[PDB]
Symmetry: C4
């Protein structure tokens, strides 16, 4: 794999792909963390959208955002997704890094906006952030992040279009509904454990803005867990040897 290929010299398109990932991740953090704080601050019992509503915010926004950006950037919104695809040689190292930076920056900005709008409840109720919950240890958290991210990245590889690519690149277009649903599902199982990270930029953006020592102590789990889950899904996709032209037929 070279550091970069000719696609990365199509500078206009490559710039707009980075912007599309930046904005999408910003929007992803804003809606989901605002949903979280809005639920956490509610004084009436059953007065909120509930944990079910939070899981929907994360799954539904990934559906919407991959839908909007798949033809522009490939629709990653998530460094572990970008990392998996890079391992499968679907993304160059240079594009991979640019994507991760755009995603981490967008994440900080989105969470930033939630804090700007509701600083009181934002600081009071945990800042959106991922950390190990009471009654679990780090090994369980990490395990839950690995397997959770595997589900996500396994779904991404199955969702790739073998013939269609994002504008001026060979980065595969992705079917958004299955990927959104994978996210929703993993939140249902993983919210009691870590909040659910499965997305290093999502975890990072919230840790940057909330800036607590507890959250920073746990932060490595939300990089290492998803990167490992991503690598194991790539390995698996490579072994069920189904890159080729296994187009999954949508629902």
């Amino acid at each position: 794999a070279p550091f970069f290929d000719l696609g990365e010299l199509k500078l206009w398109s490559f710039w707009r792909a980075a912007i599309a990932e930046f904005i999408a991740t910003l929007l992803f953090l804003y809606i989901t963390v605002a949903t979280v704080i809005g639920h956490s601050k509610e004084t009436v019992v059953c007065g909120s959208v509930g944990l079910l509503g939070i899981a929907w915010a994360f799954g539904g926004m990934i559906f919407v955002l991959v839908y909007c950006t798949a033809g522009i950037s490939g629709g990653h919104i998530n460094p572990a997704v970008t990392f998996g695809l890079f391992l499968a040689r679907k993304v160059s190292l240079l594009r991979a890094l640019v994507y991760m930076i755009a995603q981490c920056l967008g994440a900080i900005c989105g969470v930033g906006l939630v804090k700007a709008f509701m600083k009181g409840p934002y600081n009071q109720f945990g800042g959106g952030a991922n950390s190990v919950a009471l009654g679990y240890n780090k090994g369980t958290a990490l395990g839950a992040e690995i397997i959770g991210t595997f589900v996500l990245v396994y779904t991404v590889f199955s969702a790739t279009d073998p013939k269609r690519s994002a504008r001026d690149s060979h980065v595969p277009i992705l079917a958004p509904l299955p990927i959104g649903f994978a996210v929703f599902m993993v939140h249902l199982a993983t919210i009691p454990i870590t909040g659910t990270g499965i997305n290093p930029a999502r975890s990072f953006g919230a840790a940057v803005i909330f800036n607590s020592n507890k959250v920073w102590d746990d932060q490595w789990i939300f990089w290492v867990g998803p990167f490992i889950g991503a690598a194991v899904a790539a390995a698996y996709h490579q072994y069920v040897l189904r890159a080729a032209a296994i187009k999954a037929l949508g629902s």
Copy 2:
């Protein structure tokens, strides 16, 4: 941009497009505000569809209505959507205004019907209306409306079919599921703040029928916020320069 083009002289189709927008918005207000009052009036704790159920009423009805009217009017159901498309020169000024009037009228009628059916609970529990909630200021509300409407209008532009148009027009057909989901998502984040407007006709219809001074004082936020969010999504779509024939591939 001329005030109107030859499509607007196809009077039969242009009339039926206006009617389709009028009826759709009426149905949109009736189902969603009835869902709201039905939840608000419930005496049993967890005896209702909950805030999650309300968010679904708004997102799901937009999915259903854009599905039914996309081939007829372009499926706007929302003056900020019409406004964004007008800025992108996808709609003439004359069609734009006719649409907004049909949507505002339909909105009043739909809320009217909710009040006719359940006047007691209708007046008691807030009339469906949008206003700034306790503990937020006008700047937060406006900000939340801007960004919320941006998410919606960004999704609309990505959902446009570059080849297919509504009957006897060049108004693009829209993919309904992504747009419905955008609405659902924005409600999850924005219900604790304003009720969620992101739709001037939705906010106006409820303010007309509920007719409280508090709600009228706040009403400008629900026009200005969505119009700004819409204009920034148009600007953005124009800059990721993706009008051309970026057909987003559905889920």
Copy 3:
């Protein structure tokens, strides 16, 4: 319109269409009423699927069942749907009546099965049945049934395939997801008022099995309301003059 056409002399297919409607409606009543009783009997507060869960049972089962039977019968599962299509001359009188009978019979059987499985809770918690709730009058109930059924039947007409028909007939195939979603939405608004009928066979099956005088007194609303809502959606579809080959493009 003749009483019948040559499609009705294709006896093998016509018989299997009737069977498909009978079974589908039976399955529709069994799952949805079982969901209702299961929620109603639950002793823990928030220990159930909630009203949101009930609305999903009705909307999701119609999605699933129209999906399974659309190519076989046209996927009606509902006499008001059959009635609307008959008014639009898409179904003959003979097929229409056979469908309504199969649907009413299947309905009784499905509710029958719920009672057989959980007779105690079945009788205690209202039998699944539709009736006017406390605090509303008959005119509101009827109005809510008219408009609710209009939403449903308006969606059906938009969901019709202008080129594809059920086996050995000219009965249009229907797009199931939009129709399922219409049902879900109308339940969100209408459950506090009548239970939501919008389906005479659904209301009839539950009234037959539950057999209370109160429920029988209200039963006419659940025939008259949906038949009127259906006729007004047909009239409307005929006037937005969009039978022709307005194929709504799916999501």
Copy 4:
């Protein structure tokens, strides 16, 4: 029907199909049982994803997993599905057995992982397992499993692609969204009765790991019920005589 056909001598593909079923079922058990324990352990009232959230975990994971594995194995994830298809002669005896073993093994492993991560709550709150709930008898449970599995398997047969098959086989590709929705629906009606089995490998995996005598006493219902429901859906599909090339047109 011969014991096996030439497809089963394509050893590379046949091995990878078995692996795909093994992994998918493992992931199915892990996410859904983790969702169950996470809800069951929650100390705050309405502090969880609720029974609605659990029903979504089961329906949504089947949607995601059939989406990922349909082109690889046919996407069964469930011995009653495999059994139904075998009866319809769509799967050979040899492939059928290999699938059931891979599914049962994967199931044990997935539940195993949930216990490894949260052994305390895992043992305290029922291990994910299926059993007859208080206030119902075995005949009701069995009946509920039969009819529940019928809904599932009826949907599977309607979801089969008559032209497209899994890699190097004639096992039909399946439309995942309808099947996922069938699962979701049956959970809504059946959770108060048995937990919902409709999947012998799902019931077996949880019974193996939880290892209680009560759960083992009831276990036969979760094999016999779904196998019967599956056989009756096959019989029905054979009689509505719609194997041929009834392609259900997706939503």
